[PDB]
Amino acid sequence: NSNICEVCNKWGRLFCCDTCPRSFHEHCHIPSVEANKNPWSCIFCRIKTIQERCPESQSGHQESEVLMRQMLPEEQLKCEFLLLKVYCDSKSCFFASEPYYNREGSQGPQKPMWLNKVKTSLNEQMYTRVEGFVQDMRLIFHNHKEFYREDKFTRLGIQVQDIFEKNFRNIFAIQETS
């Protein structure tokens, strides 16, 4: 097994996957690493098992159809993974915790959002459809773009949103387009 957390790339108290070499801190893994279970399979392994059970799950899909799916166990897991892939980027630190807004010439967003909030919302099963989750994720970056206006810091929103968007297309097998 790896000696660093797959998500944050640090050493510390790690839990090792029993079916791939990845390792995690407890709260970096999503969901948080389970108390017992031996063997333990990480979310990367769980996601690969879904695909292997239903190879056809990788055929192209319309986003509009994906968003209306109910958050049954497999969609819950795919949203958990997609959230994890964002946390995997070091630039997610800017969006993890609750923001605040006091900049001359800007007003804060009406509906603040941040990754730890979405994490909690997933943990507490507050989303009934994939759309719920994806809207809050997109909101995080949109609020950032709107607040930082022409400051070059707005590019952080673009960058992290691109990581989201690519992973959303991958995870939910969205039909490739030109």
Please tell me whether residue 83 binds Zn ion under the rule CB under 5 A. no
Please tell me whether residue 25 binds Zn ion under the rule CB under 5 A. yes
Least gap, CB of 108 to Zn ion (angstroms): 30
Of the pair 5, 160, the CB lying nearest Zn ion is at: 5
Instruction: Answer whether 42's CB lies under 8 Å from 85's CB.
Output: no
Of the pair 90, 177, the CB lying nearest Zn ion is at: 90
Please tell me whether residue 77 binds Zn ion under the rule CB under 5 A. no
At position 113, the amino acid (one-letter code) is M
Please, is 61 exposed, middle or buried when counting C-beta atoms within 10 Å of its C-beta (0-12, 13-18, 19+)?
middle
Please tell me whether residue 8 binds Zn ion under the rule CB under 5 A. yes
The gap from C-alpha 54 to its chain's centroid, in whole angstroms, comes to 22
Please tell me whether residue 5 binds Zn ion under the rule CB under 5 A. yes
Task: Scan residues 97-126 and list those touching Zn ion (CB under 5 A).
Answer: none
Of the pair 77, 134, the CB lying nearest Zn ion is at: 77
Q: Which of 16, 20, 96, 139 binds Zn ion (CB under 5 A)?
A: 20
User: What is the rounded CA–CA span in Å between residue 124 and residue 74?
Assistant: 16
User: What is the rounded CA–CA span in Å between residue 65 and residue 67?
Assistant: 6
Least gap, CB of 74 to Zn ion (angstroms): 13
Q: What is the DSSP letter of 68?
A: T
Please, is 92 exposed, middle or buried when counting C-beta atoms within 10 Å of its C-beta (0-12, 13-18, 19+)?
buried
Window of 46-54, 57-65, 114-122, 161-169 that interacts with Zn ion by CB under 5 A: 46-54
Secondary structure (3-state) at 70: strand
List, as one string, the DSSP characters of 17-35.
Answer: -SSSS-EEETTTSSSPPPS
Task: Scan residues 121-160 and list those touching Zn ion (CB under 5 A).
Answer: none
Window of 41-49, 76-84, 98-106, 115-123 that interacts with Zn ion by CB under 5 A: 41-49
Site residues (vs Zn ion, CB under 5 A): 5, 7-8, 17, 20, 25, 28, 42, 44-45, 54
